[PDB]
Subunit: 244 residues, 6 copies
Amino acid sequence: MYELYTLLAEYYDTIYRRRIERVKAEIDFVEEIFKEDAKREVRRVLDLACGTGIPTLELAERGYEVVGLDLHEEMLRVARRKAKERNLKIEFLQGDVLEIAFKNEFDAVTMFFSTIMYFDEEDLRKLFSKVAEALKPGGVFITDFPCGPVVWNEQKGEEKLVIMDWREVEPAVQKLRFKRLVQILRPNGEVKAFLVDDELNIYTPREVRLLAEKYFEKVKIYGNLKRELSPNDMRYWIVGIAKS
Amino acid sequence: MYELYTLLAEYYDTIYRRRIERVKAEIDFVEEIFKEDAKREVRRVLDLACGTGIPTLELAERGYEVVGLDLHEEMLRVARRKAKERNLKIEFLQGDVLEIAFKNEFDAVTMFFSTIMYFDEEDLRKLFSKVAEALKPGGVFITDFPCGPVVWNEQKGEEKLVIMDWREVEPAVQKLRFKRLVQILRPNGEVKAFLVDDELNIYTPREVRLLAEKYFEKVKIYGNLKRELSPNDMRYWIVGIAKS
Amino acid sequence: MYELYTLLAEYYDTIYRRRIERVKAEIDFVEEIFKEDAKREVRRVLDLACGTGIPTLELAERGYEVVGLDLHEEMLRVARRKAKERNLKIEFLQGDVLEIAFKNEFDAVTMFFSTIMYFDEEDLRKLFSKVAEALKPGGVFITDFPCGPVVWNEQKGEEKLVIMDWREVEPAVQKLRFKRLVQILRPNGEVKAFLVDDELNIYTPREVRLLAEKYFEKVKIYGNLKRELSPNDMRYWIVGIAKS
Amino acid sequence: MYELYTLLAEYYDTIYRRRIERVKAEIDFVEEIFKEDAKREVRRVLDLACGTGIPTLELAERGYEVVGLDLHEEMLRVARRKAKERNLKIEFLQGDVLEIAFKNEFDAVTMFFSTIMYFDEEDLRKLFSKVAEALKPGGVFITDFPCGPVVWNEQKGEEKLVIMDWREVEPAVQKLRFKRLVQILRPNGEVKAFLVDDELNIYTPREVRLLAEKYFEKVKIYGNLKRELSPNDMRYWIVGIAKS
Amino acid sequence: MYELYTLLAEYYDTIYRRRIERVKAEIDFVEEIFKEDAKREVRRVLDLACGTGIPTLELAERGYEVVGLDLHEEMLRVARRKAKERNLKIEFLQGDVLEIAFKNEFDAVTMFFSTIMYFDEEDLRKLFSKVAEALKPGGVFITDFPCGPVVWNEQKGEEKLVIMDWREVEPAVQKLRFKRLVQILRPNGEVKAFLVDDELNIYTPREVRLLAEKYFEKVKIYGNLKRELSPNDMRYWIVGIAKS
Amino acid sequence: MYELYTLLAEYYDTIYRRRIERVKAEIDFVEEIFKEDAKREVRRVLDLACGTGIPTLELAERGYEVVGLDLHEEMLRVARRKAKERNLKIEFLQGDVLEIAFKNEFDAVTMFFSTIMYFDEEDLRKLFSKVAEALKPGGVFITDFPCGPVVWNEQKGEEKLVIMDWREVEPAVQKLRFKRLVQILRPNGEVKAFLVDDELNIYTPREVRLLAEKYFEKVKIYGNLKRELSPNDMRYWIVGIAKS
Ligand SMILES: Nc1ncnc2c1ncn2[C@@H]1O[C@H](CSCC[C@H](N)C(=O)O)[C@@H](O)[C@H]1O
Ligand SMILES: Nc1ncnc2c1ncn2[C@@H]1O[C@H](CSCC[C@H](N)C(=O)O)[C@@H](O)[C@H]1O
Ligand SMILES: Nc1ncnc2c1ncn2[C@@H]1O[C@H](CSCC[C@H](N)C(=O)O)[C@@H](O)[C@H]1O
Ligand SMILES: Nc1ncnc2c1ncn2[C@@H]1O[C@H](CSCC[C@H](N)C(=O)O)[C@@H](O)[C@H]1O
Ligand SMILES: Nc1ncnc2c1ncn2[C@@H]1O[C@H](CSCC[C@H](N)C(=O)O)[C@@H](O)[C@H]1O
Ligand SMILES: Nc1ncnc2c1ncn2[C@@H]1O[C@H](CSCC[C@H](N)C(=O)O)[C@@H](O)[C@H]1O
Ligand SMILES: [Mg+2]
Ligand SMILES: [Mg+2]
């Protein structure tokens, strides 16, 4: 597990070129949540499992004081490099999100790009509990998650990446095995291959809300970058608002 | 909605011939639950949304004192007819399960064949609350639910039924539109057709346990007629045990 | 052929409830075309193969002087009924679009909802030629077209419609056989069924442009209700602008 | 079973319009087999399970003396009617092919259009045994066989036929349940529907040969109207040649 | 051909980890067959095409005197290694099963895991003939057989295996081309790949029986580890019982 | 782009072994066109984008005086090598087909195997214009084109090729991204991989005829190696006849 965040860390931004191309639209939505859902001015944000800091840097660019936390130093290495290149001041920390000990010191806490799926029910409750403890009164928690083999390609410099994704689902226990073979091709034909194989957890929007309402005064479920939920939306946002 | 239980009531057992052919194995499992999970002797059972009483009669046949409740008299008419023909004594009552008012008088309450899907979150909570009140200490609540067009046929007397089912899912709001066209063919080619169109709710096993855990001391999740849950099971059983 | 416009005419608006629900967004786009693409003020519009007048009435409601033409009186009957009920003054005429003889008297000519598909190459050229002759200098022609069995349902009063669609394509000759079985169910189960079976022609956006550029000074291809064309758009609009 | 040959007999030729359009191509092949595989002159032919006599009539028209045998009078009625209309002399008899008692009476025995699928292993042996008895030395036995829901349509006069086929396969016992809903639509929308539900047997080319070799000194397997078998052929022909 | 048994021999047990996890369940069934179908005591067993001896070892472990025969030394090397490690006495021989010359020497002869698919009709007869010669009166012959691209993965120590299977079928000649790309990934990304490309033969339960009945006084067809055959079983077992 | 014609040039004929195995039938058709459609005797032929010269050599072998032109020297190297080995005299030239300047000097111009797809509308017009100039009166222009991942394999010497193809279509702009991963496996498992990634253009038969009709007196559309077009043909041939 975590092959994507260690050995493939330097290729993460390449693999997720699309996610980056639309980070601005996503943070526009996040700021609307800060403005309409939060019950306090949002200035300091804790971005959990920040990875290479794609949304982290976008938030920083807009004036937020951001602290990013990630389990893997290989990912943080990339985030710090980009922050330095863009003259953005962000505090990047290594650590497990389940072990944070911040106490009512962030106006908002975020977890971007389906990361709640890495946690089972017990760990998710632990996470939400720690997030609630990290928030200032009226602060908000924001996290997004989604509803044979597929092949695609990207390119980093002279290296071409051919990626093949497939999944194995176990509905009864709400588990999903996400597999991704990444082949890195050099100009002369030499190849290197790495296999991502992570166990993920499947949750419905209602499930997350039920688990979250236990830690936040109010929880909202939104879809498709709008502060509303439509029947056919395919990506969801859970917004937890701390009592003020 | 409810076309299947009103206009098509007399055709229900024909449409669900398969469900009937395996009711004995299902009740064998239910008795195992009464034995291993219930904390009191099970004698009096309340079967909610009993329909034509397929599992209701099988329980009665084994000596249980059963009370069956259903919203539609058309379904109850079939249940009573079969009970009479089989010399089984069962009290069949018409009524909404959400309006029951029984108090500490049933050793076990059941709801067979995916009927929880007819209730949204709010009504499901209301249902579980009333079920808990109806149960006696150590009593158990048992209910089962599942994980373009598909056509199949059955026959009742001289009439042949061609059934076409299809679904429309709204994932965001966890809603499912179950559509079923039932064509009834007579020997001379004359046809009568009826459209079933019910709005159903989509729940995961974890989700139901969460909503139920609030009303029962303990809640268990089982699969495929075994007091355990395997990764690939496709039919689930939720068992609520009243504190004893 | 044309079963949908004769025997099923009174059910057309029911079958296409969705098309109606979004006619306002479509005419908003049409007016943007009038404003930005036309080289003259648009007041009088000829709506060819107007059917039940869905977009025809919407245009009339907005102040345009509209003339609607359709081959089938059964469709016009519906259009006139709705126009009268809404106090909209529209001149509805019966006739073949390939036989129009209007001479430079319309500011714009429209053909809505994939109707160019009913015409093969030769007839399409004839149509475009007649449309060009009907337009005032700087006027515009606007028409939209799209890129096992599928079942769905609608309802008109007490009647329920179960619709099954399937197609048979002949790529070599760019022909498509559009088939639709419409079953009309009455409350007591009695049913009436009609089969739509029309031969349609398949065209690419570039094909239509090449055929249209021969009759209009300038032709534009737009997609998805925007005066631009994106790689993945699935519905197209051809806009022909007459020399001014 | 047999609904297609009784209640739907008068619609058989309509449903199998294509099977008819290429009957000449098929008989050309059959004659090639008489000429190259038969070790005697073929004059008198016994066409088993002749149905509406589609190939039976084509043979007679070419000078062959043919006797057609079928279990259903409803099918023979159509065959005789066509034989009469085309002034072709053919002896059409009603009877079960498993009960024939002919002996050294025919130069060739045929069974067209996948009918062997109606007989299980035991009955197929009985049939082959009877066919061998009916043949004259050097005579030949010829029969063809192939390797949802799917909806299609046809038309007979003013009546339109909408046909929906689907199958249920039992691989272990090599059984196939072929279902076909035939809806007959009148111009005014009135409908008549019949359900075809036959149990068929699945055989591979190898199987048939192994079963036939026991009764014919020589058994050949051909495909796609050629006296050869290619790896990807999808329609097979078994030819049994009686010892001369 | 045979790439899986030569170049990939040391990876066979990894690729077929599941086939191994249920070897005990399979031998339980095999013993049931020895006990109920064999007309003599089974002590000495000949396991044809034994491979890495997965079932061979399970039999020996239960007291049977087993002789394993395989064409490839690379596979036997693995079997002997495991036999040694588990201190099991087994005589592993290299040789072609089509060339065995045993006579009235074994109480039972086995061929596990679909290997009959490697032989065409002619060679399958030769094999069955040899097996019959090798058996003692009342002895039994047992063999199982079943009814893309698909990608899956496994792991042996630090090496990860990504396997991609696809097939090319020739229905007419009942041939199957089974292709499998096995990519072996080292932790540093280095890769080794081998392509499995075997020609296999397609047989139905009926076929095998017809071919076997010629050499065994009694031939039975079973499915899903039970001495019975159900309509939907997908894995079959052929049991040949020598005349006693 | 062009990876297939540069780095993989020496593997082209192996990858397209099938295309080669049927070149004779294709040239048989081409000669029929020279005979029935050309209005002059065909002796000198210009084969544009000749590649490794598969059809080029077949034409030369039949006595035609051929000039082959290709953008990539790597492909021409293979063509010249084969011509030399087969003692065929052909003039192979390097160059862009869009830059040809031949005038009234070829009896026929050809472009085999879907190469028109490499040109957008503008370049295709430019190409047809230059082809017309290169032809002599009554001369003919002939070109053929077709109507997740798919894996297959081939072999060149000791090297095995596993090829995985997939496509990404942009219907609105009629663009297609043809992707092909070619993995070259050596006996010891070592691998070399190359990614083909070309942008292609999608045209219908009618569309090509429209663009061509502008440069040739007559243009014909044929399908499946016959001087006619059938409804279900999947490969098309466009034939331009210069006015004679
Ligand atoms: N327990 C845990 N604690 C901290 N980070 C974790 C974690 N489990 C997973 N992660 C981190 O989850 C991240 C998922 S990738 C998503 C990255 C980033 N938020 C974005 O929007 O692009 C990885 O960087 C991984 O290292
Ligand atoms: N609110 C409600 N109260 C009581 N019955 C209800 C109900 N909503 C739906 N039902 C009943 O739900 C039943 C579903 S059919 C399943 C029937 C039966 N338990 C069996 O196992 O076969 C119908 O008989 C319907 O009338
Ligand atoms: N040759 C022709 N002349 C006039 N109308 C024609 C025609 N061929 C088809 N039609 C008409 O094409 C219409 C297609 S239905 C689309 C209707 C309408 N424009 C809308 O947007 O809803 C039918 O009303 C049919 O009668
Ligand atoms: N036991 C049996 N004896 C005689 N005919 C039989 C039969 N079982 C089925 N059939 C006949 O099988 C026929 C199959 S339909 C094929 C008909 C015809 N040979 C053709 O080529 O078109 C039906 O007409 C049916 O009545
Ligand atoms: N003609 C032949 N003679 C002996 N073994 C053969 C053979 N053709 C194929 N095989 C062997 O067939 C085996 C198939 S693999 C199945 C192995 C083993 N019986 C099990 O149950 O796991 C390979 O080990 C291969 O070497
Ligand atoms: N602009 C251009 N000018 C010349 N050749 C071109 C070209 N664009 C692509 N090609 C050539 O297109 C060829 C396509 S491969 C088809 C090759 C050959 N006609 C056959 O039938 O097998 C390649 O050899 C490539 O180099
Ligand atoms: Mg845990
Ligand atoms: Mg025409």
